[PDB]
Each structure stands twice: as C-alpha cells, then as structure tokens.
From a paper:
ZnT7 functions as a Zn2+/H+ antiporter and uses proton motive force to transport Zn2+ from the cytosol to the Golgi lumen. Cryo-EM analyses show that hZnT7 exists as a dimer via tight interactions in both the cytosolic and transmembrane (TM) domains of two protomers, each of which contains a single Zn2+-binding site in its TM domain. hZnT7 undergoes a TM-helix rearrangement to create a negatively charged cytosolic cavity for Zn2+ entry in the inward-facing conformation and widens the luminal cavity for Zn2+ release in the outward-facing conformation. An exceptionally long cytosolic histidine-rich loop characteristic of hZnT7 binds two Zn2+ ions, seemingly facilitating Zn2+ recruitment to the TM metal transport pathway. A monoclonal antibody Fab fragment that specifically and tightly binds to native-state hZnT7 was prepared, and the structures of the hZnT7-Fab complex were determined by single-particle cryo-EM analysis.
The density map showed no Zn2+ bound to either protomer. Thus, some portion of Zn2+-unbound hZnT7 has been found to form a heterodimer composed of IF and OF protomers (named IF-OF heterodimer). TMs 1-6 of the OF protomer in the heterogeneous dimer are virtually superimposable with those of the OF protomer in the homogenous dimer, suggesting that the structure of one protomer is hardly affected by the conformation of another protomer. In the IF protomer, TMs 2-6 are tightly bundled at the luminal half of the TMD, blocking the passage of solvent from the Golgi luminal side, whereas TM1b and TM4 are located more separately from the rest of TMs to create the wider cytosolic cavity in the IF protomer, while the OF protomer create the wider Golgi luminal cavity. During the transition from the OF to IF conformations, indeed, TM1 and TM2 considerably incline, and TM4 undergoes parallel shift so that the Zn2+ transport pathway opens at the cytosolic side concomitant with closing at the luminal side. By contrast, TM3, TM6, and the CTD remain almost static during this transition. Similarly, the Zn2+-unbound heterodimer also shows good structural alignment with the Zn2+ states 1 and 2. The Zn2+-unbound IF protomer possesses a negatively charged cytosolic cavity around the TMD-CTD interface, near which the exceptionally long and flexible His-loop is located (stage 1).
Numbering used by the authors:
A (entry chain B): 22 to 132, 136 to 161, 229 to 259, 265 to 376
B (entry chain F), F (entry chain E): 1 to 218
C (entry chain D), E (entry chain C): 1 to 215
D (entry chain A): 22 to 136, 141 to 163, 229 to 376
The structure:
C-alpha cells in the first residue's frame, strides 16, 4: 500500500500512466455524477465509454503482471495469452454497452432538459486532447486498442459538445453516432484478438510460409510435408508443427537441423518437426 | 557382400553423351540412396548426384542442365547419363551407397575411368622384358612386361593370371604422342626362372584385347 | 558452396607416431550439436573408404587407431599409432549443405630408414625391334626417398631428350617406391651405338649405381 | 446463400438455433407493433433487450455454421474455435446483463416508480419451449451450453418479473421487488461461472482438464521406452471440445529405433485421448 | 509378452527349391506401417546371424535368395533358390513389445539323393585299456537320411545296454550326417570276448553293413 | 572387423553369481547399445537385457530382481552380472551389438556356455582311435579321437592345429554319470597316413588343459 505510494515517485513513465488512469477514473466519476444529476445521455455514454477505457488500461496492467508469471503443469505455455484475452474482453465490453447505448437512444427517440452546468463537455474535450497527446507516440495488443478508444473518446466528446450547444432533441442521434464510432474503433483490435484466439496462421508469417515449405521440400531425402500448423501464442511468439516424410535411410539429424533453421529464420520461436521414415 | 559395379564407355567423343550402369548387390535400391561422385586430378573429388528409393533425384547445381540419374529396382540397376561431355569431364566415376541415416558414402564401386577425347581406341602392344644375357643372376631376378601404344585407360596387367603377386610393381601410364606407355615389373627367385612358366597377362577392355604372353630368356 | 581446405597438403610421419590432418570449413557445418563432416581414406588405385562420419564416429570395421574431433569449422583426423598401411590420401567431406563437397586431400607419407634402390636394366625385345621401335628401360625398386636421379649414358653420351620417368605410390607393406625410366628410339638410332647405361643417384650413398649393357 | 439455408437445416443444432431465432423475431415483430401502438413505454425497452437476446442466438448459430467450414491456408486448424469463442462471448454476455439487472434493482431500490403484464407471460412460454428445445446443454458443446445458459437467464428473468408483479397487486409487498433482481443476478452469474472457466482455460492454451490427470502416467510410459533418454517441452492444449493437441520432444539414444519410439509414443498418447500429436525425436551425442 | 509360434517345427526342402517358414504373433507387432519382426539364421555351433529386419529388409551382405513378407501377426521367410549352406535353424524375433521375444525355431533340412553310410570301427586304445575302461566306437559318416539303425554284435550276442549314439547336424556342403555309436565296458568284460561287430541298417539298401574286428 | 568376445566362468555353483565380460572391437560403446541374450535347449533364445550408450539399462522383467549390466567405454567392455543362479540358467550367453536404428541385433559374439551344477571340473581324457591292424586300407582311411571324462562343456577338438579342416566330423557331447564323453572322426587319403604325422589337439578352457595326442598305427 504505502510502498506503491512511493514507488511511482521514483519512476516517471509509470507515474505518467498512473496520472493517465487516475484522471480518467476521476473524470468518469464526475461525468457519471453529472449525467445522473442531469439527463444528458451523451454525457452518460461518454462516461461509460471512458470508464471502460480506464478499465482497459487497468486490465492491461493486470494482464502484463499475470503474463509475467511462470508456467506450470496446468499452464504449460505460461499466462501470456491473458494479454490477448484482456484485449478481447475489452472489445466485448466496448461492444455490449455501446449497443445498449443505441437502445437508450432509439427508445428515447420514440417516447428533462436541466441545462444547469452543461459546459463540462469542453472540459472533457480538453482532457481527451491531453490524453491523445500523451499517447500520440510485449505490449502490442494491450495499448493500441486503448489508443483507438481514446481517439474515439475525443470524437465522442466533440459529439457531446455539439449535442450540448444544440441543447442551448439531438441527443439520440449523437448517442447512436458514438455507438457507431465505438464499434468501428473496436473492429481492428477485435479482429486481431479473434485471429489469435482462433489458432489462425500468423499474418506476419503467412507470406513467408510457402517459401519455407519449398525450402524444406528441397532438403535431401525429404519426400513430402504434412500437417503444417502455425499459430500465434502471444505477440511475436509463434508456434509451429509439421510432419515430414523422409526416405527410409535419410539423415534425420541433418533434416531436423535444417528444418529448424529454415523456420527459425522466418520467426517461429517454437517448432516441432516429426520425422517419419517412409517404407519406400 | 555389399558391392557396386559400374559399366560404361571408357572413351567418349566430345560433346556426346556418357551412360554408366551401376549394378548393386548385397543391398536393395528400395531402401538405399545411391550417390554418383567423380574424381579427377584437377578438381579432386566432385559430388554429382544422388537417387533416392522413391526415385527422387538430387543433382549438383553445376550439372542440373546436363545430368540425369534413373534406376530400376527389379534388376538393381542405376543409370547415370550426362550430356555435352567436355575436355574436363574425363574422370573416374563411382556409384556409392549412402551410409544409412548419415551424409557419408559407406560403400563405393571400383569406378570407371571416362576419357573424353577425339582420338580412337588403339589396342595395346605388349613387349617382353628379360635381363640381358646371364649377367648378375643373383638370387632375385627382375622381369618386365611393357605396354606401348594403347588408348584409353585402363589395362590390367597380371603375372601368371594373378597367382603370383608378391614383388609385382606396375607403373602408372604416361602420355606421349597422344598415346600411352606403361611398364610392369616383377621379382622372382633365380631358381624359378627360366625353370617353370612365367607369363604376362594384359587385359585392355577398351579394345577388348586379351594377351597371355610368355616371358622367355634371351 | 562450402569450401573445405586441408592442411598440410602432404604429411610425413614415421612408424608408431601420431599423424594429424586438419580440415577447415568456410562456413559452419554444425547443426544442433552435430558436425556433418566425414573423413575418407583413398589408397593407391582404390575407391575412397569411409573412416569417420559426423566428425567423431568411427565407421564399423575400421581400426581404432583412427580418431576424429572438432566442431563448427575446424576438424582434425588423428592416426595413432601410424601403421605402414596408412599411406594414402585423406579427404574431408561436408554434408551440411547442397552440394556435397570434398577436401583437397592430404597425402600421408610413411617415414622409415633409407633404402638403396635395387637397379636393373632391360634392352628392347626382339619383337619390339621387329616392330620398328626400341625401348631401353631401367627399373629402380624398393627405395626411399621420392627424390632420385636417373641418367642415361650411351657410349659416354648424356641424353635427356627421350627419357620418361614414372613413379609409384608408397607401398602399404614396406613403404618404399619404384621408378621406371624408359627411353625410346628408332632402329637406326638404337643400332648405331653399342653400350647403354642407367645411372641411379640416390641420397643413400654418394656413389651412384651403374647398370650397363652392350650391343 | 441459397445453399447456405440447406446447410443450416442439415445440422441439428443449427436448425434448432435458427428456429428459436425466427420465433424470437416473430415475437419481436408482434411486440414492436404493440409498441408503435403508443404502448411503447416499457415495451421498447423490452424490445431492445430481446433484440440483444436475438443477437446472442445469432452469434451461437453463426458459430455453429462456421465451425463446420473446411480448413484452409490461413486457418490450418479449421474454424472449430468459433465454438469456444461463442461460449466465451455468451457467458461474457450473461454477466453483463446480470450487472444491468443488478443495476435495474437499484433503479427500483431508492425511488421505485410504479411504471398489462401479458408480454411477460408469452416471453415465459417462449422460454419454456426454448429450454425444452435446448435440453442437450447439460463441435457444439460451448455453443449449446452458452445458448442454454442464455435461455435459462431469460427464463429466470421472466420468473423474477412475474414474482415481483404477483407480490405487487394481489399481495402488496413493495419491499420484495429489488431483492428478487439482486438474487437472480447472483443466480445467473453463478450459472455462467463454469462455462466461462472452461472457455478461459481453452483460450489460454491451458492443459485440458480431462487430460491433465493422466499426463504424468503417459510421461512415465514414454520414459520406459527402450532408448528414450528424456522428455521435454511437452505442451498439450484444447483445440475444440474433446479435441486435444499435443507436442513433445524426446531425446533418444544415438542408435535408438526411431520408428518404434514414434509408434509407441503415438499409441501411448492416443489411448490418453490426444487427437493430434507431434513427437520430435532428437538423437543424442552419446 | 508377445508369443511367436513358428510353423513347421522342421522343414525338408530339396536343392534349388523354395522354402517357406511362417511366424505367427499372438498380438500385432505392427506400428504405423512398420512391422517390428526380424529373422535370424543360426547354423551348426554358430551364433544367430541376422537375415531380415523389420520383416522385409535384407541385412547388408546376406544373399538375395532370402526374402521376407507379412504384416500384423503373420510373417513369411522365403528362401529361393535353396542352397546347401541354408541348412540351419531360423528364428523370428519381435521387437514391438518389451521384452524382446524369439520364435521357437524352424530347422530347415536339405533334401538330396540317398547315400550309403561309410562305416568304420575302432577298438579301445592301449592307453584307455590300461586306464581301466574299454570303449568301442563305430563311425557312420556321410549318409542320408537322419534315420539309421546301429546294432552291436559280441560273438553273436546282441547288446543294447551300454550303447550311446551321437548325431551330427546336417552338413553345409554335402548335406549329410554322421553317427558315433560308442560302447563302454571294463577290463574283464572286454577281454572275456573276442569278436565285436557294428551293424548299420539304412534305407538305402536292405542288406545291412557289417564292420567287425577280433580280440 | 566388428567383434564381440565374451569371457566368463564355464562352471558356476548353484545360487552363486555369474559374471561375464564382453569385449568389443570395431565399434564404440558411445553410440551402440549392447544386448545380452541367453540360449538354452529348453527355453530357446531368450532376451535378458540391453545397455545403452549413456548407461541406461533395460532388463527382461523376469530378471529385473537378479540381473545387472554395466559398461566402461574407455576399455570398451560390458559387464553382465547375475545373482542366485539355478539349474535352469545353464545356457550359452551372447553379447550382441544391436542393429543401428532398429530393434534387431546385427552382430553377435561367439557366446560362452555357462553350466550351473555342484560338480567339479574334470580334466579331459584323450584316447587315440586307429584302424584295427591294416584291414581295409583302401584309398580313404578314418581315424578317431575320443575325449571322455571332461566336465563341463565345451572342448575344442582340432586336427594338426587347424592345417587340416576337410573331413573333420566332431560329435556333440553325451552326458552319463554326471560326466561328458565325445568322439571326433577324421578322414584322410591312405597315402598320407602313416606316411606323415597327424595329431588330435584337445583344448579344455575350464581346466585349461591342452592335449596334443599323437595318433599312431597299431
């Protein structure tokens, strides 16, 4: 408790991340309070969206600290996949609520102005501009999604600025607009996470695999290639398996070393080559 | 009993084709790869290719355009065909069995010498070689068989059909006037010559010449 | 391709000593703890015979006096103790890359006490004289070293024009050498002189060996 | 797309999901009509909650259809993981709605407003015929489990609404309304816990729980093979339900019988239930 | 363990014919297209020599007249053409399961034309006589078939008490057999009689062969 | 040149321990596993165990409680130790080089016969067997060498120190009164006996007895 209070003072980038998440959570609480006091659905939607952006950053940190952990009998590959899972979960929790936001919009669109202090929208604009300025420059699929979501938050704050200045009802249209923006923002992160979780061939490995297969086929005494499976374990960590059929007298040591060289040059960290001697 | 025997033309015209048949025994072509390797005094040992049990063939990239290796498992034969034979293709060609599960060649054939030249096959001329008169009889007396004027390699020179082999010194051939000279020397006890029969047997497979000439005193 | 350089080109070792042959590879022939390097021995007029495979493994049936060692790019074939049969050319072959390549070869020469050459002379045979030629041949058998000088005297006249020297490889039993020095002439050239002598100059003794005949 | 509909009706689970989705959408059109007759006050909220449900069954049906697609270059293992992903999404859906039901209780906990109950009854009957259809939820395991849990959550929500309403009119106990929602959100979270645990385990490349208890014996039997020196880098994971993938590297003797070792290792792990096995064999120096 | 049953227990095959030996395994010795069955040949007083490995692969150097076939539990070793040297015991061994187990063995007998036994007799030596015993040995060399009858006549008296018969394995060049029929007695038993005769009854001729000596 | 040679005690008392040393040549124990297999007339060929190049051992499960195999790579030796030997352990024990990458044994030693009994070693009794007087001289004459009174098996019986091999017909031993007897029959042209010398050499390694009996006419 007290150790974490003094630890972030020693470092600088972790202190900046702490300021990021703390301001996000504080302003999310503020927007939720004001949207409860008022009836600003756009403000409530931005609160929920950012609320979940801050949870995305926190879950990314938790996923990193869990992925640091060791492997064991149950988890032979380690807890690295949690990283991917975290991102995926974020997208799901970003697609559910936004869609539900859609609901409140169109519902209201069919069947409580309370201006009070509607000027907090420009404050949200300033905060989101600061956030995207700080984040303008294995943590690939943890913070890229967060960057996309804070860009969407800036656009949504612009939208709620428009809704507020129109209020002086254009609230349901901005609600469905931010819902569409959130969905289109979470499409690519969800696509990457789905690709990894579906045991798909790594996209950075796809175009170099026919060349690898041709080079492996050229090895002396190799007859055919079977059952080639390649997938992404986590960021830049690829797992590959293949079964070679070889001549009945083939040099299996040499073929194993050459196949491992061929696939190591292509970026496959873990490779499993099963060599089967043919009858003829 | 693992044995590889090559059979091919000793003399090949330039820019023509060379065809060697390697017959194997003691092992099957259905589970062993056979390598083809040539050795020449200029380029040393050069690997030509390998045929695998399923018929897959791998070649040296410098011969990919003019080489072809095939085989038939029934008669246990491997066929080696090279095209565009040039002046530096004259070499001893061996078919070698691959060492199982290794990159080495565990058994080798005796090899066939291939000479690429426009000269024609000349049968050898065999000349006896006895010491002058009876001077220096001693206990060890040297006899010789001279092979002049043959083309190309090789000739097998033996003494009493190979029954006697100790003290037999056969000398390598030498080129002059586009033809070849060779000498074979043998040392025999003085009480054995001219007591019983001593003979020089010369075999020249290029011209299919067989000689079993007797050695007689002067 | 991978170029294999063998040093030294020739080696001279005595009986019961150690011989070391070194092969250098341009690129590494190692893969995952296996050095794909093999050693062959080629005797006089024989196909190469495998000695070592994978740089340290004895082929089944070859003598225990042969040994292999090395990794990456440096390899050593060691013969200890050296026998008389070990007189041959030794080759290193890599199989880590396509194509297979062999070394240049190292010829091992067996060292022993010097021996005086057994010198004999031979006139042309009657069949060869009737053919149209005349070859006079001097044989020098069972000597050491390779360096030997042969002179041809024809009634005291020195001739270096039509003389051919042929050497033999080192014997696998007694580790000696043989030399054939032949001279060729026509009928008139052979018959216009009488005496022919082959002269053998060797490092064993300062006095050269004379072998002569007449007519 | 004409042949797509024939494929949907060919499969048992795909056709059941399609029929349930179509029935939900017909109930949807009838509901939305009664809403656009100016009675939309709570109706349109129910309508978009049920449209979210229809999205959940659509996700399950799409996963069932895609999982049977032939494998290709990009998807070497096929599309079977779309099953597991469905069980991950559906469970992750049911938690989210749970919280909202939780939140809904708060909406009637501080200042509950009193704002003809028939649509709940037809939704209930829909839910009973659905749970009758999807009784199998006790590669289509994660899809059926998630869809059955979704149907059970909706059935529970109907029970809660009906119970709250019958205490409203005939009994008049206002206190018992939020507690029903609190309890029933608790119940649906506990219902979806196991499916989420299994889906997270599968997607985290964890060792299969059914395979985990018999793996040391398999390692011991592989160790007893003649000429095997050691085992290392053994990795076993779940591709889809009941399909396990295993990889391992053996060190063996320099002259060991690799063919026999490979056959015996594959037999040992085939009796254990591993469907895809990759045994790399490395010959030692000595 | 896997039980291997070899049928027939013995096989008689003439020259240049085909010999077939079957091995039946209790369980399958197959794995992924490989049959882990091997065939050995054990000659007279020799260690087993591997002929076939993995049920179809000839060992390096064995003659081509041996062949193997089969899968799962049934395997066949075929010798064609059958030579005289192929007279031996043939064993099937599985290596699919621990422990390695061998077949019972099939003895291949070479069939040929019948030969009359060369019969000789040998009385007790003087050294054995002075020792205290007396052994009379009748030798029957180079005959066919195995079956032969030996009788001992002592002045017209038949004795089947102290006779020991020793067979030999079939010859590898001439495919024959040998018989050593020995009789043992003491001093007085040997010297109280004069004539001893060994009698050879064979299928080759109806008349038995008489080999006699006196004193 | 691949050779395996077993050295072990021919006679072992029942319930003692048997130690055999197999010395190998032509191959190294650093890449070859060595099997131990015994053969008896009752149980036939029977696998006992194997030692691998890294020192891993595998045993027949019926012998796991009383068998041990060790080795030393430097001197190229493999040691076989069995405990509590009973009467059924009398067999010919062989050390066998396994065929590489296969489950078969491609090289075998000559084997050592181990007899488990409480009897003592008896040196052999060698007796000549000449034809009776000169009856039936003919052109072919048979002689015999009777080795009676040795224990245990085996003995090597040879004629003229291996110079003469044709016509040698040695017979297997017969057991009576705990004691072993055998005969060896040889044939020779009549122009050779008694013209020159023929001898029967009997070697009994169990008692280390060498006999060079001279066959003489009566």
């Amino acid at each position: 408790i007290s150790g974490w209070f003094r630890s972030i003072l020693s470092d600088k980038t972790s202190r900046n991340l702490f300021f990021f998440l703390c301001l996000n959570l504080s302003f999310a609480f503020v927007e939720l309070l004001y949207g409860i006091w008022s009836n600003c659905l756009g403000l409530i939607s931005d609160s929920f969206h950012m609320f979940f952006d801050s949870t995305a950053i926190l879950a990314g940190l938790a996923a990193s600290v869990i992925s640091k952990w060791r492997d064991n009998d149950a988890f032979s590959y380690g807890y690295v996949r949690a990283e991917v899972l975290a991102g995926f979960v974020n997208g799901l929790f970003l697609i559910f609520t936004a869609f539900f936001i859609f609901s409140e919009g169109v519902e209201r669109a069919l069947a409580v102005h309370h201006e009070r202090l509607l000027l907090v929208s420009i404050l949200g604009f300033v905060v989101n501009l600061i956030g995207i300025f700080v984040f303008k420059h294995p943590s690939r699929q943890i913070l890229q999604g967060v960057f996309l979501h804070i860009l969407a938050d800036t656009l949504g704050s612009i939208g709620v600025i428009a809704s507020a200045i129109m209020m002086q009802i254009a609230d349901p249209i901005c609600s469905i607009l931010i819902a569409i923006l959130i969905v289109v923002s979470v499409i690519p992160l969800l696509r990457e996470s789905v690709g990894i979780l579906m045991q798909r061939t790594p996209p950075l490995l796809e175009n170099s695999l026919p060349q690898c297969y041709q080079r492996v086929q050229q090895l002396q005494g190799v007859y055919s290639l079977q059952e080639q499976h390649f997938w992404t374990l986590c960021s830049d960590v690829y797992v590959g398996t293949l079964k070679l059929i070889v001549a009945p007298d083939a040099d299996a040591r040499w073929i194993l070393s050459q196949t491992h060289n061929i696939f190591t040059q292509a970026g496959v960290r873990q490779l499993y080559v099963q060599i089967d001697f043919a009858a003829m | 009993e693992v044995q590889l025997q090559e059979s091919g033309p000793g003399l090949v015209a330039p820019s023509q084709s060379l065809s060697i048949t390697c017959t194997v025994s003691g092992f099957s072509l259905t589970n062993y790869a056979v390598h083809w390797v040539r050795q020449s005094p200029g380029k040393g040992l050069e690997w030509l290719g390998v045929i695998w049990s399923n018929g897959r063939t791998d070649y040296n990239a410098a011969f990919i355009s003019r080489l072809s290796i095939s085989k038939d498992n029934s008669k246990s034969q491997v066929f080696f065909k090279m095209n565009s034979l040039q002046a530096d293709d004259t070499a001893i060609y061996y078919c070698a069995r691959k060492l199982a599960y290794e990159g080495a060649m565990d058994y080798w054939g005796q090899g066939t010498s291939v000479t690429v030249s426009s000269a024609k096959t000349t049968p050898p001329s065999v000349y006896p070689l006895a010491p002058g008169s009876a001077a220096q009889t001693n206990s060890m007396v040297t006899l010789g068989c001279l092979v002049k004027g043959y083309f190309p390699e090789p000739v097998t020179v033996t003494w009493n059909s190979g029954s006697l082999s100790s003290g037999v010194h056969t000398f390598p051939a030498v080129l002059q006037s586009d033809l070849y000279t060779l000498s074979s020397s043998v040392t025999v006890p003085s009480s054995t010559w001219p007591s019983e029969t001593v003979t020089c047997n010369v075999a020249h497979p290029a011209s299919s010449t067989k000689v079993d000439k007797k050695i007689v005193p002067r | 391709d991978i170029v294999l350089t063998q040093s030294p080109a020739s080696l001279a070792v005595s009986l019961r000593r150690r011989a070391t042959i070194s092969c250098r590879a341009s690129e590494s022939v190692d893969g995952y703890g296996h050095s794909f390097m093999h050693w062959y021995q080629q005797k006089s007029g024989q196909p190469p015979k495998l000695l070592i495979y994978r740089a340290s493994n004895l082929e089944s049936g070859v003598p225990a006096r042969f040994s292999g060692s090395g990794s990456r790019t440096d390899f050593t074939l060691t013969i200890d103790p050296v026998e008389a049969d070990d007189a041959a050319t030794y080759y290193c072959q890599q199989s880590n890359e396509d194509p297979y390549t062999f070394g240049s070869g190292t010829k091992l020469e067996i060292k022993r006490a010097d021996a005086a050459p057994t010198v004999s002379i031979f006139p042309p045979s009657s069949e060869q004289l009737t053919s149209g030629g005349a070859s006079v041949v001097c044989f020098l058998n069972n000597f050491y070293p390779k360096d030997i000088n042969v002179k041809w005297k024809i009634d005291g006249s020195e001739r270096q024009n039509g003389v051919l020297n042929s050497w033999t490889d080192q014997d696998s039993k007694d580790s000696t050498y043989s030399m054939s020095s032949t001279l060729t002439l026509t009928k008139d050239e052979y018959e216009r002189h009488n005496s022919y002598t082959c002269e053998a100059t060797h490092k064993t003794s300062t006095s050269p060996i004379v072998k002569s005949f007449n007519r």
